[PDB]
Amino acid sequence: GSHSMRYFFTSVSRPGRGEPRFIAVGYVDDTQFVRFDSDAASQRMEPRAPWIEQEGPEYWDGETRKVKAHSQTHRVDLGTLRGYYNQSEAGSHTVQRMYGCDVGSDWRFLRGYHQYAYDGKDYIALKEDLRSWTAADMAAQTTKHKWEAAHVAEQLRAYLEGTCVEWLRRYLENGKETLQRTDAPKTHMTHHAVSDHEATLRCWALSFYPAEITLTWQRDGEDQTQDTELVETRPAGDGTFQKWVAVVVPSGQEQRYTCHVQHEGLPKPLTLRW
C-alpha cells in the first residue's frame, strides 16, 4: 500500500554550558534508517538499517553536511524563539521539526509535511496544499511573514514532491526484502481466573510489521468495549510490534467472546476463540 519517509529533529538548550543537544532520526514507514546525535563521537549521519549501508561516501558526506547545518539552524531558532517569547537565558527549551512525504497506492506523490513545535506545542506547519502556513500565535505569525517573503513553501514543495518521493522510492527498492514485506501478527489467547465466577481472556498479537493494527472483542457477534483493556502498540526491539486486548467474562461463557484482528499482513481479518 502507501509508504512514507519522515525525519524527526529535536534540539534542547543547555543554559549551564555549551550548545544544544541535537538528535535527528530518519524513518521509512516504521523502520529507522539513519541517526545523528550531536553528543556522539562520530559527528556523522550514521546508518541504522542494513539497506542504507549500500549508499556510498558521497551520500554520507552530503547527509552529514546537511544534518550539521540543520543542527546549527535549530540552535539559532532556540535563540530566536527565546526572544519572541521574551524568555530568559536561564531555562532549557525544546524545538522539534518533522518533515517528509507519502507515496500512495499508485506509487506517486500523495502528501507532504513540514511542521515545527516549540516547547511541545504547535508553532508553524505547512498546510496540505504545500502553499500556505498555519501559525499558532503571533510569534509564529512573524515566522510566517519571513517564510512567505523568502518563498520557503515553494522550496519545500519542490523537495517534497521531487527529491523526497524519488529517494523514498529508491530506499523502498534497496530495502525491499524488509520494507516491502508485511509480517502478519502471531496471535493467541490466554485465560486467567480473577474470582471463581469471572475470567480474563487476553488476545495477543506479536511480531507484526508495520505497527498499524486493530484488535477488538465481540460478544455474540457484536462489538464489546465494556470491561475491556487495550495496551498501546509497543516495539518488540527487533523491528516488529506487539499489542494485546483483554476482556473480563463470566466463567463458563468464554465461547461467546471472539477476538478480531485486522492487519495489512492478513488477507482477511482473523477471528480467535477460546
Binding site: 547545518a69 539559532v76 531558532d77 521539526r97 515545527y116 508553532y123 508553524i124 523568502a150 523526497c164
Partner: peptide, 9 residues
Amino acid sequence: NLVPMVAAV
C-alpha cells in the same frame, strides 16, 4: 535524503 536547506524561524 535530507532537505538541501532548512529555513530558520
